Amino acid sequence: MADQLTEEQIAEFKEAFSLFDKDGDGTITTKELGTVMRSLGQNPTEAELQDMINEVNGTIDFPEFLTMMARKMKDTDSEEEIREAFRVFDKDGNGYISAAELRHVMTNLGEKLTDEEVDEMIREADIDGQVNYEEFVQMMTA
Amino acid sequence: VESPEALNIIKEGHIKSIISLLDKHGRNHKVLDVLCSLCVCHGVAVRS
Amino acid sequence: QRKRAVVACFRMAPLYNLPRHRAVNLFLQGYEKSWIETEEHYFEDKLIEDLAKPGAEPPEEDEGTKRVDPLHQLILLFSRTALTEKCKLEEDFLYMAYADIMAKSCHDEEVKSFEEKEMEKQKLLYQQARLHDRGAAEMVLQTISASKGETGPMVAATLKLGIAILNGGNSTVQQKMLDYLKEKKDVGFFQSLAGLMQSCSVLDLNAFERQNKAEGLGMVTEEGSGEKVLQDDEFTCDLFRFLQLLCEGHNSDFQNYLRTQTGNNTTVNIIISTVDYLLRVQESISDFYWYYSGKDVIDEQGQRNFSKAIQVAKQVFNTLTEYIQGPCTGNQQSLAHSRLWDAVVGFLHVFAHMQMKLSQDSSQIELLKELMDLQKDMVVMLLSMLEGNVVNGTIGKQMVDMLVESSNNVEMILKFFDMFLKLKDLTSSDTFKEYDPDGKGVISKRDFHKAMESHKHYTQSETEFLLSCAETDENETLDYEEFVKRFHEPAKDIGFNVAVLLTNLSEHMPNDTRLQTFLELAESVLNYFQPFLGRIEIMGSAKRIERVYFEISESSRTQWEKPQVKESKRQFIFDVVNEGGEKEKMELFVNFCEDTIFEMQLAAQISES
Amino acid sequence: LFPDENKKHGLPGIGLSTSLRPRMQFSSPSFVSISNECYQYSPEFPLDILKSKTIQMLTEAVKEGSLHARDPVGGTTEFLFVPLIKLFYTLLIMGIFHNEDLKHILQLIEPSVFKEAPKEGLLQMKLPEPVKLQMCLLLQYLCDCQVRHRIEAIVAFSDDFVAKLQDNQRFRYNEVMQALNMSAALTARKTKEFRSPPQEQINMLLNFKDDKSECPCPEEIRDQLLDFHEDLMTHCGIEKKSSTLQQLISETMVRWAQESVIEDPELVRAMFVLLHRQYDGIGGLVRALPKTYTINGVSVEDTINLLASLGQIRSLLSVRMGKEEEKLMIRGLGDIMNNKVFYQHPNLMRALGMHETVMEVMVNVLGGGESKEITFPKMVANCCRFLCYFCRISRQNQKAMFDHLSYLLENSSVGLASPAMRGSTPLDVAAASVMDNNELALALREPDLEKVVRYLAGCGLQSCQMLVSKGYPDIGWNPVEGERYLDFLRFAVFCNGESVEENANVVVRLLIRRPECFGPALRGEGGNGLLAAMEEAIKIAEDPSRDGPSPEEDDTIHMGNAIMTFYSALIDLLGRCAPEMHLIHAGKGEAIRIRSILRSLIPLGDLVGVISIAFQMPTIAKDGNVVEPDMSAGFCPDHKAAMVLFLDSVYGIEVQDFLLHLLEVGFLPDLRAAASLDTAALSATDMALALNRYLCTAVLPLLTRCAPLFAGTEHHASLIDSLLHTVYRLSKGCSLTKAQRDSIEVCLLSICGQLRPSMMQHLLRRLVFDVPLLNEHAKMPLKLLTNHYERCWKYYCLPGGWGNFGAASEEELHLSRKLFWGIFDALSQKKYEQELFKLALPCLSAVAGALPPDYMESNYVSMMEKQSSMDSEGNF
Amino acid sequence: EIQFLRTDDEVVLQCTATIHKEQQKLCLAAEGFGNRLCFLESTSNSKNVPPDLSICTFVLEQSLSVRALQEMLANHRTLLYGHAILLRHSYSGMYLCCLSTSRSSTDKLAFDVGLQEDTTGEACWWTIHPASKQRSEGEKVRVGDDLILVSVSSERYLH
Ligand SMILES: O=c1[nH]c(=O)c2nc[nH]c2[nH]1
């Protein structure tokens, strides 16, 4: 999580918090959080209010608000990733990477150490080549 | 001049006693120097 | 987590996707790291000359006294700041800047002839005089003393300045430093030296393992190379180089003062502290070798850690050699009774095993060269220990005991040197030259094995070990020219000191069967080095006859054997024996030596092959 | 960089400067007003009049001193020049002078050098030493102006250079994508640039200064960068009168030093600093570029506000801390929190170094009365909260904060025992400095953990002075602080869901060296044990007197819950420090030793008993309202979560007898209680949510992992059918998150898959009633039935049976037929849904395949079927 | 000249106990025959009761470093602080070791020290560590110096 939020959506979060303004702590209460959530567009439940509210008085400062928002929203950020991943190479549409391209993308871009590609395909012979980007990435990570 | 710790001991009563020394003994510049030391010590100002 | 780094690598978004200001900031940082920092210009010598030049020293219209020059004023300011008593030596940006400037001004930096060699010596002396004529040595000592044993950029800059002004063994700078120390009775200087040498770091295997774990878990070191291992190798090397330069030139006054401060209330034994640090670094090197022993290959990070540790150990060995050369009998006794022998035993074990390990691999040539250069320095230090010894001396007995303790490692080293010294008469044999009718120089593995079997001087184990060490080729043919240049050339260069040490020990301990065993083990190495081991006897400074061992070049032997030199020798012998008086016979002999030294150079010039 | 093509330096200060600078504001001094808001900002003064008078007076003084008359203003040359030059330098620092005034004052300083493109300037008029020092300050400011102009020009060029570089990089990316199919092999090497961090990308893109043909940067871009670099070098002076400020300053300093022996060390230092600055123009940029940041126009106002707040905070460092100054800096810290630039530009924040400023503030506050109770605990808390958020902002910020670990750990005992101050202590700052960062966790040293262990030992040996002063019972140890130290050790040893082996081993070794860190129990020599200690804590919580001080929680500590939390934190830390299964299998001696140590420390029976300890269910009462036990004053499922973690990590579950015994002692009662808490009123209670979280986080995943142990389990049919019924009822219960529901689905599917076919009859009976509804909850039962019938089709179709398992009892067949017909009718009469149909069709196919084609429709129904217990909604 | 401990030497392990505010010297002893467990024999009352040193005398069969011990387990030394030693009972011929079983007198996290025939495993090996700050790791063992022994298997001290 190295600044997973960008200036744009942090700025929109900024007007959303400042719509009640009022020195920041003021008018940012428990009831206002659901209002700002469904002004942004997402609909959390009453429990999805109470969990954050009693995890944190009732007045929420901007640092804590942005921290909880970033923590929850740091997900579903791989969509454009996989889009670009299959758009880069293997344009035939089969969605499967050849053994040569698998070796070529394992050639470490920052570590520069070789033959671990061949080791991985040896240890994943069944996966082989016919290997898809997405199911490959969640097989390959934990 | 030397001890900042001893400067915290000085209070309103001591400052007013020094000012009364100015009032009673006349014009002495050493009293003004002491007041300057009370105001500023080692580059750190004492607002009180 | 390496897999996590890989997926983050795929998910990364490029520069053209990045906004303009973010990329501008990143480019600013990269530009600063790559171009501005790497930009270098040389101004230190000119600046120091301008500062040292007095201005209008006739037109001042004062005539009261000679005003101190700007450089003198700056040095006085720094010296007064150092002399001002404080609990801690505060960091001074002006001090780092100008100490670096003066250090870079006092060096002004193939084959060089005598004329330009003393040109450079005179220039260096003048540049060092520009500083030490204005209190630079005293200021350096004051800063070191005020450091109070705390390592930092101040101590680093002060040590660099001291090295710059002490390069070449500046006798005047040494005398000034000693006079200041004796006059001030500065125990703080020696206490700070001891504290700094204690604070010097060594190889950290735990830190290396943690760094390796971090690298293996896929997270890349965004900063430079991991310096947590051998935190300040340059600082340690500079400190021990300064200590060595204090005693450079066999300056007995420092050689004794560092051991003991006679006129001071308290005394610190710099010699013992140095040997303690040598023991520490030897233990670190041995542990790191034991970490890498099981592995077949050594990575680049490990190899560079070996290189830095080897450089540090070499500097410490040179410092000890400068301590004991002389002779300085007090320092010799101190190191004889110190823990030097254990460190030497550990180094011998490391050398004996690492030579065999790194010979097989073809990517550790530089590491092997560094290691055996360290071995040569260690043997030089041992010879300096043996300096001034008598027959059946205590130091000789102790060194024979050390060899007995390291019997296995010594035997392996001797076998290594014999094995890589027989390569010349293996290759030059006609039974080998017939395998290669042309001068191309490539020979097959099968042919080279058969020639080594037919030579009958290589056993089967040696034959297979040289085959393992042989450089593989796609055509399975090795260039024995590059093979011998890679392996035999380090021999006859590092093995000569071992041969000299063995000969000295044998001649000064004539009744030691333990040493006799090593002599029979090293029979062939001594046989090879006989044509090059020059042996004379001189009238020593201790009012005793001392035997001296040195190196004779085969080129020198050839020029001596050339007919014109022989005719000159015959004429000289007749002249001195018949009519030459015995009163100035040695004078005539030295004159004949100098004329022959020139005649042999001329013969080498005229001869061509 | 240069005003025109003729590359000659312009007059310093003159030009267009766009760098952000503090706003200049003044208040009118009026003593008839009662506003009280004028006490901000300095009082006003006529700045134009002051500027004009200063210029006129400086000109007059220069002309008068050129004559060397014996009548200086004030009686001495120092009295004439030092105050006037001080005022002039102050105005120049303020930036009041503009254009013509700057030209005039520069010509006064040195007419020859500062010509615009019999008269002697200040620099060559035989000035005294204080005047020389002030002139050195003035020349220092001029050099600073030159450096700032260089920085601005560098940024100006950098934009267009980066824009062109980005455009060319996009073009190269597109051409690589187009030539992909032909090139094949080299595509990876061309995309290596597009798969490296942007810092590395720019590093290699700029790596063409000397040779290094390994640079994708084109010739035109390379030439542009080289030309700008040459121009910058020329401006810096790296590569006939002086004609230059640098040459003029160098000559002036050398001439002064060789003309007089300066008796002022400050003057000597200033002169030589100025000379080194002139000779090290590259060093100025080397120092300036790291502190150079660029922003877009939209962020200008926010950046200015943040800089004003930072300036106020920095200025408060020069005044002694008091109530008013503490309030001011708290307000400034809050303003810096609220400013969005603090989150958008952590690199800018670090370059400004406000973390160091707040760190110095905390150092000052602690050092003031470190011996006695710390003054301004509110300020300490605010500083610590700021540092924690600063750590959370970015990883680089966390690494920068890591350098101050020693001080934070030294002062870790600031406010540990005070509640409501959590996350506002130096211990919390250190924990944030190492939390979820594998580099920093591995970089943690052994002395730091030794200090933490020593503090934990002190807490376990001695009570809390503040608590016993407030009136809490004087037990012989400090659970409140021990728990926080244990939490810091947990953060040290556990990172990113993985256990740091080195830190775990070090912590375990230190803990076993100092056994008093385990609390009064587990020490031996009279210690009772984990189970006995937790029962004692239960009794303490039940008895008010030993719990509170007995003179909103506020100052209440709930000492029983404190003891429970301390023991739970210790158990969790040890469990996270436990070695891993792959290392144990490999046979690491250290791992085996650590596992043996932990096993000997914590007996398995104690863990089993503590898990078997029951909770306090919320109870509905008269008036139709629920009474709820307090979370903070009693036993919590978070406590048993640590027990489950330790039992799984150290002892592990690898045998069916232990698995089923643990299920029947500890897990099934909790599952049954959570299922019983599924009514509408009790579902939102704290007990229910906490228990559901604990179950779906620790118990159900453990059962999923140990599912294969349910292979041969014929005799404990009642137990592991009660388990299935409780799991299904709890799944049907509402107020469960998506993750909890998915965990329930996975656990139930795995257990049923590993179970025997003949013994899930009761679960089939429960499902035959709920599946035909085909509501939202039905997807898990449809998947379960599909998998069960696909795996156990032979148990029904073949007359002989699957094997030793047997065959159906004919009421299983009746239930299966009823399920098939109900699903068929529901899907026929149900409106089309994509996923629902896609899940229902395989279930129908599996049931149809499982049912024997010649199965007889039982006109004689099962043996007087007992559906009396079955009900609508209530079901019981 | 203070003598240094060398492998083929017989030694006795003495300890001081200030029981009932009186110093007593106790030698570590064992029977071996029918009693594997170890005990302590008083030597301070030698003028009134003869100590039995035949069961207290130990021999240092081997003295190998930690790395050497690990290598040996995988597949005339002079004693140096840091080596792992093999203390063999002179009478029984068996070796000092930390027994897996414990007397369980509220020690809980401790074992018992006795004798066993087999040298296999790390139970029989003990590592020497310096007593005070003057002595360091890696220097020779002196006759008059105090030391602390750490069991290799149980990482515990003789207590
Ligand atoms: O002192 C010297 N004596 C010589 O004979 C000689 N030859 C070269 N260089 C020399 N130096």
Q: What is the DSSP string of D756-780?
A: -GGG-HHHHHHHHHHGGG--GGGHH
Please, which residues bridge with residue D234 across strands?
A: none
Same domain for A24 and A57, yes or no, is yes
Helix ranges (H only) for C387-444 are 394-405, 407-421, 423-427, 430-433
CB contact under 8 A, D276 and C97: yes
Residue A126 forms contact with C (CB below 8 Å):
no
CB contact under 8 A, A109 and D192: yes
Domain's final residue, options A19, A46, A75:
A75
Same domain for A19 and A52, yes or no, is yes
Helix ranges (H only) for A4-125 are 7-18, 30-40, 46-55, 62-73, 79-88, 99-106, 116-123
Residue D325 forms contact with B (CB below 8 Å):
yes
Please, which residues bridge with residue D449 across strands?
A: none
What values do phi and psi take at C267, rounded to 5? -130, 140
> What's the domain range around A42?
6-75
Contacts of C460 (CB under 8 A, 6+ apart): none
Query: Does the residue A61 lie in any domain?
Result: yes
Residue A1 forms contact with C (CB below 8 Å):
no
In Å, how far from its chain's centre is CA C385?
17
CB contact under 8 A, D343 and A10: yes
Structure tokens at D502: 């080195």
**The tokens 């600082």 sit on which residue?**
C235
CB C24 within 8 A of CB D162: yes
In Å, how far from its chain's centre is CA D718?
48
Same domain for A81 and A70, yes or no, is no
CB contact under 8 A, A7 and D344: yes
The C-alpha angle C16, C17, C23, rounded to 5 degrees, equals 65
Closest CA to D777 of D703, D842, D839, D854: D839
3-state secondary structure of D132: helix
Same domain for A102 and A88, yes or no, is yes
Pick the residue from chain C with its C-alpha nearest to A80: C11
Structure tokens at C336: 């004889």
CB A87 within 8 A of CB A133: no
- Rounded (10°) CA dihedral D229, D234, D238, D243: -170
3-state secondary structure of E38: strand
Furthest CA-CA distance within chain A: 62
For D20, other C-beta atoms within 10 Å of its C-beta total 11
Same domain for A94 and A125, yes or no, is yes
Phi-psi region of E155 (alpha: psi -120 to 50; beta: other; left: phi over 0): left
Query: What's the gap in Å between C122 CA and the centre of ligand 1?
Result: 18
Phi-psi region of D806 (alpha: psi -120 to 50; beta: other; left: phi over 0): left
In sequence order, what DSSP letters do the residues of E53-82 get, joined into one string? GGGT-EEEEEEE-HHHHHHHHH--PBPBTT
Closest CA to D828 of D839, D837, D819: D837
Query: What's the gap in Å between C560 CA and the centre of ligand 1?
Result: 17
Q: Determine the straight-line distance between the first and last CA of chain A, rounded to whole angstroms.
A: 17
The C-alpha angle D637, D643, D646, rounded to 5 degrees, equals 145
CB C198 within 8 A of CB C139: no
Q: Confirm or deny that A23 is annotated as ligand binding.
A: yes
**Which contacts qualify for D378-381: CB closer than 8 Å, 24 or more apart?**
D378/D326, D378/D330, D379/D321, D379/D326, D379/D329, D379/D330, D380/D414, D380/D415, D380/D424, D380/D425, D381/D415, D381/D421, D381/D424, D381/D425
CB contact under 8 A, E67 and C339: no
Same domain for A47 and A98, yes or no, is no
Distance CA D689, CA E154 (A): 45
Distance CA E126, CA E151 (A): 5
Chain D positions in Cβ-Cβ contact with residue E102 (cut-off 8 Å): none
Pick the residue from chain B with its C-alpha nearest to D367: B5
Chain D positions in Cβ-Cβ contact with residue A62 (cut-off 8 Å): 337-338
Closest CA to D511 of D485, D535, D530: D485
Q: How many residues does chain E have?
A: 159
Which of the other chains make 3 or more beta carbon contacts under 8 angstroms with chain C?
A: A, D, E
Overall resolution, Å: 2.9
Closest CA to D410 of D442, D367, D439: D367
**Which contacts qualify for E21-28: CB closer than 8 Å, 24 or more apart?**
E27/E51, E27/E53, E27/E56, E28/E56, E28/E58, E28/E158
CA atoms within 13 A on the CB side of C135: 18
Distance CA D572, CA D645 (A): 7
Strands C442-444 and C477-479: antiparallel
In Å, how far from its chain's centre is CA C31?
37
- The verdict on whether omega for the bond into residue D218 sits within 30 degrees of 0, i.e. cis, is no
Q: Which of C6, C11, C220 sits opposite A81 (nearest CB)?
A: C11
Q: What is the tally of structural domains in chain A?
A: 2
Q: What is the DSSP letter of E129?
A: E
Chain A positions in Cβ-Cβ contact with residue C11 (cut-off 8 Å): 77-78, 81
CB E15 within 8 A of CB E40: yes
For D138, other C-beta atoms within 10 Å of its C-beta total 19
Q: What single letter denotes the amino acid at residue C410?
A: V
Distance CA C86, CA E143 (A): 46
- The radius of gyration computed from the CA coordinates of chain E, to the nearest angstrom, equals 16
CB D236 within 8 A of CB D99: no
Structure tokens at C92: 């001074």
Distance CA C377, CA C325 (A): 13
Q: Determine the straight-line distance between the first and last CA of chain D, rounded to whole angstroms.
A: 86
Structure tokens at D538: 């239960």
CA atoms within 13 A on the CB side of D516: 14
Helix ranges (H only) for C59-105 are 70-83, 93-105
Structure tokens at E29: 């002893």
Distance CA C162, CA C239 (A): 9
Residue D822 forms contact with E (CB below 8 Å):
no
Nearest CA-CA distance, residue B27 and chain D, Å:
24
Same domain for A49 and A95, yes or no, is no
Ligand 1: atom nearest CA of C593 is 5
If contacts are CB pairs under 8 Å, which of residues 98-157 in chain E contact chain C? 138-139
Q: Which of D166, D209, D442 sits opposite C34 (nearest CB)?
A: D209
Strands D42-43 and D26-27: parallel
Chain D positions in Cβ-Cβ contact with residue B45 (cut-off 8 Å): 318-320
Contacts of D661 (CB under 8 A, 6+ apart): D608
In sequence order, what DSSP letters do the residues of D566-627 get, joined into one string? HHHHHHHHHHHHSPPHHHHHHT-HHHHHHHHHHHHHS-HHHHHHHHH------EE-GGG-EE
Closest CA to D426 of D393, D446, D401: D401
**The tokens 């090295």 sit on which residue?**
C163
Same domain for A81 and A55, yes or no, is no
For C196, other C-beta atoms within 10 Å of its C-beta total 22
Best residue among C587, C597, C601 to mutate for probing ligand 1's pocket (most ligand atoms within 8 Å of CB) is: C597
Closest CA to A76 of A4, A125, A126, A7: A4
CB A129 within 8 A of CB A102: yes
Distance CA D548, CA C602 (A): 105
Distance CA C233, CA C314 (A): 12
Structure tokens at C377: 């320095």
Query: Does the residue A1 lie in any domain?
Result: no
**The tokens 């156990």 sit on which residue?**
D792
Contacts of D317 (CB under 8 A, 6+ apart): D357, D360, D361, D364
Chain D positions in Cβ-Cβ contact with residue B43 (cut-off 8 Å): 318
Interface test with C, best of D190, D252, D258 (most C CBs within 10 A): D258
Contacts of C185 (CB under 8 A, 6+ apart): C263, C264, C265
CB D468 within 8 A of CB D474: yes
Distance CA D66, CA D55 (A): 17
Pick the residue from chain E with its C-alpha nearest to C291: E67
CB D421 within 8 A of CB D381: yes
Ligand 1: atom nearest CA of C598 is 7
For C566, other C-beta atoms within 10 Å of its C-beta total 11
Same domain for A50 and A83, yes or no, is no
Distance CA B42, CA D113 (A): 40
Chain C positions in Cβ-Cβ contact with residue D203 (cut-off 8 Å): 30, 33-34
CB E96 within 8 A of CB E124: yes
Q: Confirm or deny that A115 is annotated as ligand binding.
A: no
CA atoms within 13 A on the CB side of D708: 2
CB contact under 8 A, D280 and C97: yes
Chain C positions in Cβ-Cβ contact with residue E136 (cut-off 8 Å): none
What are the respective helix, strand and coil percentages of chain B, to the nearest 5? 65, 10, 25
Q: What single letter denotes the amino acid at residue C70?
A: P
D659-671 in b/e form (b: 16+ CB < 10 A) is: bbebbbebbbbbb
- Name the residue with the closest Cα to ligand 1, atom 1: C594
Strands E38-42 and E22-30: antiparallel
Q: What single letter denotes the amino acid at residue B1?
A: V
Domain's final residue, options A29, A54, A75:
A75
Please, which residues bridge with residue E99 across strands?
A: E112
Residues of A with CB under 8 A from a CB of D: 1-3, 5, 7, 10-11, 14, 24, 47, 50-51, 61-63, 66-67, 88-89, 91, 100-101, 104-105, 107, 109-110
Closest CA to C9 of D760, D181, D476, D194: D194
Helix D198-206, helix C20-31: angle, nearest 10: 50
Same domain for A130 and A114, yes or no, is yes
Q: Confirm or deny that A90 is annotated as ligand binding.
A: yes
Query: Does the residue A86 lie in any domain?
Result: yes
Nearest CA-CA distance, residue A81 and chain C, Å:
5
Give the domain CATH number at A44.
1.10.238.10
For A16, other C-beta atoms within 10 Å of its C-beta total 16
Structure tokens at E129: 């560590």
What are the respective helix, strand and coil percentages of chain E, to the nearest 5? 10, 40, 50
Distance CA C529, CA C524 (A): 9
Distance CA D82, CA C68 (A): 27
CB D373 within 8 A of CB D426: no
Query: Does the residue A101 lie in any domain?
Result: yes
Helix ranges (H only) for C294-406 are 300-324, 329-336, 340-360, 365-386, 394-405
Distance CA D460, CA D455 (A): 9
CB contact under 8 A, B47 and D318: no
Q: Confirm or deny that A96 is annotated as ligand binding.
A: yes
Residue D315 forms contact with B (CB below 8 Å):
no
In sequence order, what DSSP letters do the residues of C508-548 get, joined into one string? H-TT-HHHHHHHHHTHHHHHHHGGGEEEEEEE-TTSSEEEE
Query: What's the gap in Å between D822 CA and the centre of ligand 1?
Result: 116
CB-defined site of ligand 1, < 6 Å: C 114, 594, 597
Domain's final residue, options A75, A96, A112:
A75
Same domain for A26 and A14, yes or no, is yes
D402-417 in b/e form (b: 16+ CB < 10 A) is: bebbebbbebbbbbbb
E60-83 in b/e form (b: 16+ CB < 10 A) is: bebbbbeeebeeeeeeeeebbbbb
Q: What is the DSSP letter of D416?
A: T
Contacts of D612 (CB under 8 A, 6+ apart): D665, D666, D669
CB contact under 8 A, D202 and C41: no
Same domain for A126 and A81, yes or no, is yes
Please, which residues bridge with residue C178 across strands?
A: none
Please, which residues bridge with residue C283 across strands?
A: none
Q: Confirm or deny that A94 is annotated as ligand binding.
A: yes
Strand E14-19: give its sheet, edge to edge. Answer: E14-19, E22-30, E38-42
Interface test with D, best of C18, C24, C43, C102 (most D CBs within 10 A): C24
Q: What single letter denotes the amino acid at residue D80?
A: L
Structure tokens at C261: 């401060």
CB contact under 8 A, E138 and C290: no
Q: Determine the straight-line distance between the first and last CA of chain C, rounded to whole angstroms.
A: 64
Query: Does the residue A47 lie in any domain?
Result: yes
Closest CA to C270 of C344, C222, C322, C341: C322
Q: What is the DSSP letter of D522?
A: T
Distance CA D54, CA C338 (A): 75
Residue C96 forms contact with D (CB below 8 Å):
no
Distance CA D500, CA D491 (A): 10
Q: Confirm or deny that A135 is annotated as ligand binding.
A: yes
CB A7 within 8 A of CB C19: yes
Q: Determine the straight-line distance between the first and last CA of chain B, rounded to whole angstroms.
A: 17
Helix ranges (H only) for chain E are 66-74
Q: What single letter denotes the amino acid at residue D2?
A: F
Query: Does the residue A105 lie in any domain?
Result: yes
For D179, other C-beta atoms within 10 Å of its C-beta total 13
For A110, other C-beta atoms within 10 Å of its C-beta total 17
Residues of E with CB under 8 A from a CB of D: 106-109, 155
3-state secondary structure of D297: helix
In sequence order, what DSSP letters do the residues of C467-490 get, joined into one string? HHHSPP-TTSEEEHHHHHHHHTTT
